Amino acid sequence: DDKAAILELKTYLRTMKSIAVDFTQEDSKGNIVQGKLLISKPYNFRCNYYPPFPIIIVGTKNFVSMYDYDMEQVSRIARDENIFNFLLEDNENFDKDFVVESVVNEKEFSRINIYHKVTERHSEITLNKANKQIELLKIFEDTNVVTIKFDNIVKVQKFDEDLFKLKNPEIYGVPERLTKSEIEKKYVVS
């Protein structure tokens, strides 16, 4: 078995603890959106879609929530409806949580098909072997495929803590809306 794929995949999970990613997201429903994804393992992440895509997703150890500016709505995201679940996975937990369905290797790219043992959600991961980075992530939700393209990955040395907070808008008001430049102003690169 091409077990090296898990090794490479595991390596990424161990070394990408604190990153910011410029990404493009495409779906079967026609949406195309760009955004900034901040990951601060063990549990914290912020998916900051750029305008006009009115959604911010903030995940912490206690909660994973979504805010829709257009709907003025706060929601909670089930692990089965979290497309960023693999990126938070600890390597030690990989074998407990995922099973590799298949591996395909072409030139510098390696495509790994995996499935979550609990949520049974299938996903496809593209690995760039030259720089050992994830380039494409595909999530299969019944009749919809969500594709996340990793346009740029940078390591972060310190995050503004409030980037991983989503305060009750009913009490503390609407969360700050951040553009690409605005969000880059609130964390320090390595």
Task: Give 33 or 156: the residue with its C-beta nearer to Cl ion.
Answer: 33
**Contact indicator for 9, 125 with CB cutoff of 8 Å:** yes
Q: Which stretch binds Cl ion (CB under 5 A): 4-12, 67-75, 121-129, 182-190?
A: 121-129
**The binder of Cl ion chosen from 116, 122, 177, 186 (CB under 5 A):** 116
**Contact indicator for 113, 105 with CB cutoff of 8 Å:** no
- Output the DSSP codes for 12-68: HHHH-SEEEEEEEEE-TTS-EEEEEEEEETTTEEEEEEPTTS--EEEE-SS-EEEEE
Cα distance between residue 4 and residue 63, in whole Å: 34
Cα distance between residue 89 and residue 93, in whole Å: 7
Establish if 110 lies at the interface with Cl ion (CB under 5 A).
Answer: no
Establish if 85 lies at the interface with Cl ion (CB under 5 A).
Answer: yes
Establish if 177 lies at the interface with Cl ion (CB under 5 A).
Answer: no
The footprint of Cl ion on residues 33-72 (CB under 5 A) is none
**Contact indicator for 156, 44 with CB cutoff of 8 Å:** no
Min dist CB 171 to Cl ion, Å, is 26
Q: Which stretch binds Cl ion (CB under 5 A): 38-46, 64-72, 112-120, 177-185?
A: 112-120
Q: Which stretch binds Cl ion (CB under 5 A): 4-12, 62-70, 120-128, 147-155?
A: 120-128
Query: What is the binding site for Cl ion (CB under 5 A)?
Result: 85, 116, 121
